[PDB]
Amino acid sequence: MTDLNIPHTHAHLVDAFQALGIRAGQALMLHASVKAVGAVMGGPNVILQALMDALTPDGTLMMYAGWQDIPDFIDSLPDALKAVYLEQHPPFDPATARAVRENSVLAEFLRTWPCVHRSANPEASMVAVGRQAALLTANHALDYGYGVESPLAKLVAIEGYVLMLGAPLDTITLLHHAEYLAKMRHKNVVYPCPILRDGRKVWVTVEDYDTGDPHDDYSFEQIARDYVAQGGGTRGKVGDADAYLFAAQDLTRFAVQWLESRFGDSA
Amino acid sequence: IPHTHAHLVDAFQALGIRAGQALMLHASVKAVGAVMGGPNVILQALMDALTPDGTLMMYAGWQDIPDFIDSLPDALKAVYLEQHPPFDPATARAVRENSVLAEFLRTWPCVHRSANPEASMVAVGRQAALLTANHALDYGYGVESPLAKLVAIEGYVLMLGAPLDTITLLHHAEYLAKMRHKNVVRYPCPILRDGRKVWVTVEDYDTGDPHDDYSFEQIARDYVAQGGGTRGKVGDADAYLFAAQDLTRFAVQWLESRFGD
Ligand SMILES: CN[C@H]1C[C@@H](N)[C@H](O)[C@@H](O[C@@H]2O[C@@H](CO)[C@H](O[C@H]3O[C@@H](CN)[C@@H](O)[C@H](O)[C@@H]3N)[C@H]2O)[C@@H]1O[C@H]1O[C@H](CN)[C@@H](O)[C@H](O)[C@@H]1N
Ligand SMILES: [Cl-]
Ligand SMILES: [Cl-]
Numbered sequence: 001m002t003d004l005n006i007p008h009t010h011a012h013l014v015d016a017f018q019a020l021g022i023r024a025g026q027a028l029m030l031h032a033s034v035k036a037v038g039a040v041m042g043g044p045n046v047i048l049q050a051l052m053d054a055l056t057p058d059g060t061l062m063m064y065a066g067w068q069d070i071p072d073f074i075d076s077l078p079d080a081l082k083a084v085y086l087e088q089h090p091p092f093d094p095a096t097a098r099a100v101r102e103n104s105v106l107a108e109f110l111r112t113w114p115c116v117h118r119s120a121n122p123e124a125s126m127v128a129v130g131r132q133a134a135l136l137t138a139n140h141a142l143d144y145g146y147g148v149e150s151p152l153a154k155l156v157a158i159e160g161y162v163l164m165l166g167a168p169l170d171t172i173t174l175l176h177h178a179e180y181l182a183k184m185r186h187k188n189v190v191y192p193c194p195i196l197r198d199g200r201k202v203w204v205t206v207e208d209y210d211t212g213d214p215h216d217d218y219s220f221e222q223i224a225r226d227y228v229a230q231g232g233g234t235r236g237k238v239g240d241a242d243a244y245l246f247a248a249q250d251l252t253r254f255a256v257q258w259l260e261s262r263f264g265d266s267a
Numbered sequence: 268i269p270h271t272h273a274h275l276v277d278a279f280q281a282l283g284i285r286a287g288q289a290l291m292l293h294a295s296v297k298a299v300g301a302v303m304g305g306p307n308v309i310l311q312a313l314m315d316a317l318t319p320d321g322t323l324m325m326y327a328g329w330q331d332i333p334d335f336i337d338s339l340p341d342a343l344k345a346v347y348l349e350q351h352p353p354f355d356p357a358t359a360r361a362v363r364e365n366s367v368l369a370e371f372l373r374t375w376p377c378v379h380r381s382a383n384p385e386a387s388m389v390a391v392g393r394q395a396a397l398l399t400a401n402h403a404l405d406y407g408y409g410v411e412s413p414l415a416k417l418v419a420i421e422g423y424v425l426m427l428g429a430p431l432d433t434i435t436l437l438h439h440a441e442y443l444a445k446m447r448h449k450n451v452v453r454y455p456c457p458i459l460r461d462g463r464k465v466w467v468t469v470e471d472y473d474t475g476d477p478h479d480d481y482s483f484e485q486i487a488r489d490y491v492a493q494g495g496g497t498r499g500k501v502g503d504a505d506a507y508l509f510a511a512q513d514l515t516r517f518a519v520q521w522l523e524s525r526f527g528d
Contacts, residue, residue, distance in 0.1 A: 035492035
């Protein structure tokens, strides 16, 4: 066994974020495992407070939220059960829809922050605070939620960064944007979703690339590990966690080239 | 100055290796750095710390297992069925990834190797026969397996620069866990029976992909984060030492609370 630490302070997390390369005004997408950072004096919100302190109010912080309770599976239910879901399941409400189960404690904290913004796409919904929170989350199209009209696309375009805080590299949502952009020999295209329109629940059909299964013989772990191996990003400790800092545009470029050279029209 | 035998012994003991322990090793020889006398000195140092009363195991598998023959042209499959050699524990090579040390261990005097081709384990030391004996061909990571026995004798898993995703013991956790759905595989394999090649059908849980929305890295990272195991440097490698019983219990709970029915 390994015993818990004396709790990390706000100031010592700011120092570590800066030592890693976080700079004022950057736009960051964070993937974190809170337990991996270790005990923090004041709890997990201090992680976010420290990171925004390193970024200043001129910086921007975004996290993937999705929607834990999306009823995207109801076509597989028998007719009577499906009818029950159609009538009784709540719509996606950006104010109260809970983020996906894993590695999302900080996303849920971010939702109680004043001036938080949440994008409109339920399954692909992102949350953000800071200078470009509105810009990044605006007009997130319902179809192809990781594509050209996504917060991921905008993060790449404003040359933001991805910060890994003890989360496995294959949870980098940006890699779904690489899948979207890459010209590949086989893609799976897929579902119902209740949303709010003028304050009333309406069911819509969302069209997207499948993001549950890969489009071919690969895994996100493979791409990311290949990226780190070739020098991508910077590394450093943040609390007890091993942290990685990646340029969004570079990683996206690398991943699209990775996918196209194996399964693309250049293979 | 390459790492000396003594330097590695002291690092193993600093990490928590002790005389008499039964240990499964997962290593990346590259990660350790140059060792004076080569990679075998890693194993000699570890066995020195364990003493002859200790036991050292690694996953070997079978690099050349022809479990893919049904996906070949029929004409080629027919050639495989006539000409591909059976699994022979004496000479079957281990799988290529992170296995330099497993191949070294296969030349140790008194090494034992378990009979399940795909799931084959090699071991030396006091309990090497116990661990490798009567390894069932079906469900090779299940109840009749070296992993089950490693847990029963309160052994350990030592990660020596190898990735946390490569912990074979977690396939035993997958076997044990009551989950909503587990994928079963059935595949052909030639083995030796009374000195003769016989092709058989092996049944197992899939070990190539997880049975649900998880990764082994994620489980082991959660384990470490909640205080599981010890950590430290061995040579140039990041090392982790886990108790096999506690890690299995943690991983089964982890799987059941997330993907149970
Ligand atoms: C309309 N959506 C479904 C389309 C359907 N055709 C897909 O099969 C289905 O995906 C299954 O569920 C994944 C769990 O992640 C399994 O894939 C995992 O298993 C292996 C695969 N190699 C791992 O290696 C890999 O990492 C994967 N994690 C798939 O079997 C989709 O729903 C999921 O994905 C949605 C994201 N849009 C979530 O919103 C849902 O809650 C739901 N989890
Ligand atoms: Cl978390
Ligand atoms: Cl190796």
